[PDB]
Design a protein around this ligand. Structure first.
Ligand SMILES: NC1=N[C@@]2(CO1)c1cc(-c3cccnc3F)ccc1Oc1cnc(-c3ccnc(F)c3)cc12
Length: 363
C-alpha cells in the first residue's frame, strides 16, 4: 500500500481530496473524499472556481443514462446529468472500473472559491445515494468489478493538509497500538453509537440516547465535531468550567469569533464507542490540538447540530480510521501523524464495561 500513502491533499477547512481519472483517454480531476455522502459527482461545465472539469464529449467510453439528478443538501446544492464511464485512482489500486458519474451542470455553494478540487466522492452506502438507492455508489462498483477487498482506511493528518486513503486495506505503519472496532449500526451513513462522553475524565452523565439523537456518523466531509444541541450545551458547560483559568466570550464558544495567544488549560474529550462484544466498549480521546483550529489565533471547532453527532475532521485527525465494510465495523487507532504535545497524546483505549449500550441508539 506504499503507493497510496500521502495520496490525499487539501487546504485547511476545504476538505481532503484524492486524484482520480474519468473517461477514455483519462481526464484527471481532484476529488473531495466524503464518507458522509454516496454520489460520485464531478464538475462538467466551466464554473469560474474550477481548475478543470469533466468533458464528456472527449470520452469514447462515456454512456448517458439519460436521467437528471437534483441534490440539495444542508449547506448547498448541485444538479446534474447521470452517466457511466471508466474511472481510476492513480495512487490507488491498479484497476479501472465502470462507475456512475453525475456530471454537475448547476450548483450553489458547492464548489469553494480558491479550492483545488472539482468533484465529490461519496463513500457512504446506496441508501443515501441520489436519486435513490438504485444508483450504485463508486466503492460498491469498485468491489463488485475487481478483487479489491471491501474496506478502505483514512489517515487525515491536518495551510496545506495531507493524508492517506488506503483503498482495499490497512497500512500498519500509519498507526500505533491496536485498532478497536465499533459496529456500523446501519449501512447508510457510517453510523455508530456513542455510549459515554467524558471531559477531562468527567462523565457528562446524560442519557446516552442524547449522544446519538438522531444519529452519530463518521464523516470526512465535515470539519468540526458536531454535537446534538442538548449535548453541545452540556459539553460547552463542562469545557467552560475546565478552562476557567482564562475567560472567553459567549460568541467564541458558538464559533462566532476567534481567540489568540496555552494547551494545558483546555480539557481532553473522550468518546466511548460501542464495542464488538456485549457490555464492552472502548474510548477515543482527542486534544485541544484537534478541537481548537488554526485560522497564533484559533477557532472553537465543536458545534451544535440538529442532524446528530458528526465525527468530522476534528475527531478523524486524531486517528487512523478503518471503514471495514466487509465486517460492518469501523476501526480506530492512534494516528502516527496526529498533532500533540509532550504532555498529552490522543488515545484509543479499552476494554471498558458499559451496560445497556443498545439503549443508546435512537429509533
Ligand atoms: N459530509 C458532507 N459532505 C457535504 C456536506 O457534508 C459536502 C462537504 C463539503 C466540504 C466543505 C468544506 C470542507 N469539507 C467538505 F467536505 C463540500 C461539499 C459537500 O457537498 C455535499 C453534497 N451532498 C451531500 C449529501 C447529499 C445527499 N445526501 C447526503 F447524505 C449528503 C453532502 C455534501
Amino acid at each position: 500500500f506504499v503507493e497510496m500513502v500521502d495520496n490525499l491533499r487539501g487546504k485547511s477547512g476545504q476538505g481532503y481530496y484524492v486524484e482520480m481519472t474519468v473517461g477514455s483517454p483519462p481526464q484527471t480531476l481532484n476529488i473531495l473524499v466524503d464518507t458522509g455522502s454516496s454520489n460520485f459527482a464531478v464538475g462538467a461545465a466551466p464554473h469560474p472556481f474550477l481548475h478543470r472539469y469533466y468533458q464528456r464529449q472527449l470520452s469514447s467510453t462515456y454512456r448517458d443514462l439519460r436521467k437528471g439528478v437534483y441534490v440539495p443538501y444542508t449547506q448547498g446544492k448541485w444538479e446534474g446529468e447521470l452517466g457511466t464511464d471508466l474511472v481510476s485512482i492513480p495512487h490507488g489500486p491498479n484497476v479501472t472500473v465502470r462507475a456512475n458519474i453525475a456530471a454537475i451542470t448547476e450548483s450553489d455553494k458547492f464548489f469553494i472559491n480558491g479550492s483545488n478540487w472539482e468533484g465529490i466522492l461519496g463513500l457512504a452506502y446506496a441508501e443515501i445515494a441520489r436519486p435513490d438507492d438504485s444508483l450504485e455508489p463508486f466503492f460498491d462498483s469498485l468491489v463488485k468489478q475487481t478483487h479489491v477487498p471491501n474496506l478502505f482506511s483514512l489517515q487525515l493528518c491536518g495551510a496545506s493538509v495531507g493524508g492517506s486513503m488506503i483503498i482495499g486495506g490497512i497500512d500498519h505503519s500509519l498507526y500505533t497500538g491496536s485498532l478497536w472496532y465499533t459496529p456500523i449500526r446501519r449501512e447508510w451513513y457510517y453510523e455508530v453509537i456513542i455510549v459515554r462522553v467524558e471531559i477531562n475524565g468527567q462523565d457528562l452523565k446524560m442519557d446516552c440516547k442524547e449522544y446519538n439523537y438522531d444519529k452519530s456518523i463518521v464523516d470526512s466531509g465535515t470539519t468540526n465535531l458536531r454535537l446534538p444541541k442538548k449535548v453541545f450545551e452540556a459539553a460547552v458547560k463542562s469545557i467552560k468550567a475546565a478552562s476557567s483559568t482564562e475567560k472567553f466570550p459567549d460568541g467564541f464558544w458558538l464559533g462566532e469569533q476567534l481567540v489568540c495567544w496555552p494547551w494545558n488549560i483546555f480539557p481532553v474529550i473522550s468518546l466511548y464507542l460501542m464495542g464488538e462484544v456485549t457490555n464492552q466498549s472502548f474510548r477515543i480521546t482527542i486534544l485541544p490540538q484537534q478541537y481548537l483550529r488554526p485560522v497564533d489565533c484559533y477557532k472553537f471547532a465543536i458545534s451544535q447540530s440538529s442532524t446528530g453527532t458528526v465525527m468530522g475532521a476534528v475527531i478523524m485527525e486524531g486517528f487512523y480510521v478503518v471503514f471495514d465494510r466487509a465486517r460492518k465495523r469501523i476501526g480506530f487507532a492512534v494516528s502516527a501523524c496526529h498533532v500533540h504535545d509532550e504532555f498529552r497524546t490522543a488515545a484509543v483505549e479499552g476494554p471498558f464495561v458499559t451496560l445497556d449500550m443498545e439503549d443508546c441508539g435512537y429509533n
